[PDB]
């Protein structure tokens with residue numbers, strides 16, 4: 001469904017997303033989606049919003065991430081929905 005070429009595309013995070021990304025990676029004017037996905041994923045793991053003991057679901061209602069995605073939780077395996085939530089928070093270059 002999701003082509004690997006999508007990860008090479010260039011995007012610019014809006015202010016709130018950039019704030020989250022900055023807590024795990026260096027600030028950049030333009031990121032590749034691969035970068036956005038890793039930093040977002042790393043943020044989730046270091047803050048333990050995703051416990052591999054809790055069946056693929058990320059709980060973020062007590063985190064800025066929840067404000068960013070507009071949901072209290074989501075599955076790490078439903079990638080299509082994740083992409084859609086992320087794009088609400090960035091502008092394509």
Ligand SMILES: CC[C@@H](CS(=O)(=O)C(C)(C)C)N1C(=O)[C@@H](CC(=O)O)O[C@H](c2cccc(Cl)c2)[C@H]1c1ccc(Cl)cc1
Nearest residue numbers: 037038040041042043044045050076077078079080082083
């Ligand atoms: C927090 C879970 C995170 C850790 S990671 O693989 O990024 C890691 C930081 C370990 C490299 N993570 C995963 O564990 C796995 C889950 C799986 O096997 O499907 O891949 C996720 C993923 C990669 C690329 C695109 C998407 Cl939409 C999701 C990805 C992910 C990235 C970003 C969001 Cl918002 C949600 C999920």
